[PDB]
Symmetry: D2
Subunit: 339 residues, 4 copies
């Protein structure tokens, strides 16, 4: 009846580790026992409450929780006790709005979000909607699979909406937490991959993961270089959306090409409409994804095509993890290990 | 031997009506006797030398010339003497680059542009490439059809790239020279049309042409109203591309929707990345169109679905017309009448 | 506690109008009072039990029932008492299989079918799944809207999967119970309609409904004719699926075109793989549609774009209705009027 | 002045290896010195004149000729002397019909076909239209690349039109001359490949080339097995269209899936309309492809993803070759070597 969990009580404050009541599932709900729980920058923004729509205090963060179905409410048929599931950002949606009926539930105006508008996975247990959980692959461990619920589906869907075709070129801009996962999806999707970053080790990693071309933006203008070397990319996935990354993306793409934006930066970005219109460039926003996107993302992991860089930490130490993220001292993804 | 033509001999200077030699079709070329010749803002930009890539001086403007094939060079099979044809913006393209092979010849780096890089239809005769001329509908007059070569194909392709389909909502932003034509194409394409402008008469016109709803942005916030009334529009066609229209388009579009920018504004626009990403919005530019787009655009006119607002002027009075366009005192489209 | 209902108790046997218990909604279910109930050939097949997968006896047919929500079980948020709803062929689907997740719930292997695998609309009351009912437009009467639940969505979805665009040609093959509805959707979707049939009166009905071209296959080869007169059709909707209509569709469609089969005939059809391959033709089947398809199809009715030719009858005369259908003596659609 | 060439002079007869005049390029044409020349079953059908539209006698067959541009006609700009090119099935097209304008020149009704309606590559030299030749990759030898002009583009385009996405399952039906190349393209396109045939040596070749699953059609039932093993294939590419292969494809395909037919068999094939409609299956014909398809297909060979199994033979032995083909006793692809 009691469990440990990291709670946000004041925006900007450190999280407190508490013993709170174990959530019980009602009709059409399930309870999940958390075995691992991914951490990412979205959790920082949730804890700082610096986005337009804020979480309601207090709340348990975490939209990358994975574990076992430990209890089942009435009317549940998709999963059963013992099943390995994840509880992603899309906690639930209404299921009958236009978006939901067309398989774009990720756009549902009535959606709830895990570890944001409802309690998430920074706890030993969590109550989820079984219609929206991710069904985890048998072959992949909890720690390794957790980031796929977030980083994985985000970059996979992002790549899909670049509208690129096997054999065509895609630039992965930024080979960090998201980017290094993106390279692997891109290669698995038959794309020729160009990696762009400012860190030579990250570029090497990209090459190892499948990138045929890699350019260090500190040593050379990536736009001019790529235009010359590959004739511009058919697609660009921008995983870290800084003003510079945005501008460079526009310069790197070939005529008729598409730029997909994964990040959520603040402010207005300078956009060369003249060039975009003239060059017939498309700019498209894409974050997370639908249930089908998620299952597809998980399958690539199961098949051995994608493996996130993961490092573990304990629930108790979640505040140290946050600190490391804030300072940009994390390489890969960090995952809380509950076992 | 000789013919009258309006000629640009210096950028920014008034045009002069000169007697010049009648152009002669060589092999693979045809000669066209101009019966009418549309005028639009692009001609100003051409005559002003406003754009980064300029016409060579001196030149005869006019990318909206229509008339009869008057002479046929050797090796021509597509048209014959007497055929009614138009010589649109796309004078020619290479035909074998990646873009040309994919049916996107509008992106051809090697393209020539009528009344810009080569002489156009502000003259009694013009030489054209028969592989790129528009084949005009039997049933529509020269004056009436001229603007379809430019305004028509521009808004039609624009609507196509909003990726909408019958029954869905599209906003036509701006019911002016392009906008009044766009409303008609949109309705013929089975779209529900919401018109937005600041002029009562233009909004009335929009409704007359098939718009289901009309919002006057002077009196009501069209973003707020449309979000509340129709849940936002699946597509937005921005026909007057200003910073304000851009920002309002983002407000009017529903999640997952597409904004098409139908013009070449100067200077960067501020793009709120956060909203674009969260809402999963697509932004793209669309100006003119391919030969396929052009033929399709003309067929809609032939079928009676689209009729541009047109008033005539004489070649001799071209500078007055330029003046009126510059002042923004033109309602509809102006077409030079050579009859 | 009781109600009238037409019940099938023996396959092939005349239906019996019986007094049966009024069905009560459990958790997540709703009850609908039927005001009108469309009849079609699918009901004959249900009653005859001649399809591979058969209904369980005894059962109440009817998948075109429309009426008011008369009661609501617990955990129901989509509808409430008084709401006008329809209970279409797709009674329920699992909601989480590959097909359901992608908004293709019509392919769900676990689907239930109204008036086939569960009791349907040939009764005064029926219990339905609120997540799958059709939400009816306020401005259309129960009798007029009923056939939209079946004929409407069927031909609308069929038209969608012909992959045709506004301005393109579509052949409506057979201008009968389905076809006369199809001509109307097609025109509302911006398609040029060519009607093909062997009944002059049916062909003239097509023209009245917006067909531009009409060919009697009895005296003229529609394939040869259309290939000459319009260049072949971009799409063909076959609403009366016979081997001849099928073979002719293959001749009528232009290269790269698409044939949609809108029916469930018995037996294998001879298909000239040679012509299909050489002509790059696409062939696919389509019946009824998804919840999204249904709501979209109802919208066209709400806007006055589509009206089915409807005649009414009494529940007690259902066997007579069946009789007329079996003989082919039905013009338009027949709807049981529960008033 | 003169050259060796294999000529068809009578339908069904042995080819005569003669000395004939060397074709000379006129305006807009180029001359190609053949270095290698693929042979395939289409060549047999050309020589036997058993297709509805027949070649005109006499003629030199061969639509898989590759070599060097040996001479250039007037006004040619796409290629130059020395360039390595191939002369595929699509010799030329309108350039301006609806199909050509939309980048589907493969469907042009006015197309010429290499080694069928015009002289082909079974000779030391050939004249071709530079606008339609394949531009060969630098690092691939003539013998190796030749079959890509026919087998390669055919299966690549076929795979594209199965509408399958990376991570999805495709069955390659028949691992023969076409099939063994198809397995390689499919793998490069991120598809998971199930190879199906009746020859265990072929299936081992498949696995060798990346097939993840292989099932012998004479051993077990492929439909039942794949439905169990994989849940059915999202796509099926039928490279050898035998009545049993066609029937088995309809059984192997997943609900909502697509079957692409690459073959040109004689006669009608039985198609279960009932199942096709109910399972929402798409049947699509596809052979060869556009210039864009061809260049993409060559790019995969350049990138190292695709290599045809090739064996050489001398021009003077072409009759022996045909003999080997007819007896279904040819492994991989035979290429005539003019070195
Ligand atoms: Zn995350
Ligand atoms: Zn929703
Ligand atoms: Zn213009
Ligand atoms: Zn080009
Ligand atoms: Zn029905
Ligand atoms: Zn399902
Ligand atoms: Zn061949
Ligand atoms: Zn053509």
């Amino acid at each position: 009846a009691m469990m440990k969990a990291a709670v946000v009580r004041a925006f900007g404050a450190p999280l407190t580790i508490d013993e709170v009541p174990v959530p019980q599932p009602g009709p059409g709900q399930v309870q999940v026992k958390i075995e691992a729980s991914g951490v990412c920058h979205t959790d920082l923004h949730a804890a700082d409450g610096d986005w337009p729509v804020k979480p309601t205090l207090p709340f348990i963060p975490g939209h990358e929780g994975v574990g076992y179905v430990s209890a089942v409410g009435s009317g549940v048929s998709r999963v059963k006790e013992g099943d390995r599931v994840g509880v992603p950002w899309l906690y639930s949606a209404c299921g009958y709005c236009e978006h939901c009926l067309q398989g774009w539930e990720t756009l549902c105006e009535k959606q709830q979000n895990t570890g944001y508008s409802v309690n998430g996975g920074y706890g030993e247990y969590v109550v989820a909607d079984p219609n929206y959980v991710g069904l985890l692959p048998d072959k992949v461990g909890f720690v390794e699979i957790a980031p796929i619920l977030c980083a994985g589906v985000t970059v996979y869907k992002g790549l899909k909406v670049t509208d690129t075709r096997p054999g065509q070129w895609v630039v992965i801009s930024g080979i960090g937490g998201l980017g290094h996962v993106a390279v692997q999806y891109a290669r698995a999707m038959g794309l020729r991959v160009a990696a762009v970053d400012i860190d030579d080790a990250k570029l090497n990693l990209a090459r190892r993961l499948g990138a045929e071309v890699a350019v260090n933006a500190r040593d050379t203008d990536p736009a001019a270089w790529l235009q010359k070397e590959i004739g511009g990319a058919h697609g660009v996935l921008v995983t870290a959306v800084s003003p510079k990354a945005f501008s460079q993306a526009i310069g790197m793409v070939r005529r008729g090409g598409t730029i997909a934006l994964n990040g959520l930066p603040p402010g207005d970005f300078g956009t060369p409409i003249f060039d975009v219109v003239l060059k017939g460039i498309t700019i498209r926003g894409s974050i997370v994804g639908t249930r089908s996107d998620l299952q597809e993302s998980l399958d690539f992991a199961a098949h051995g095509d994608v493996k996130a860089t993961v490092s573990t930490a304990k629930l108790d130490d979640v505040n140290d993890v946050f600190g490391r993220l804030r300072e940009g001292k994390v390489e890969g993804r960090v995952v809380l290990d509950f076992s």
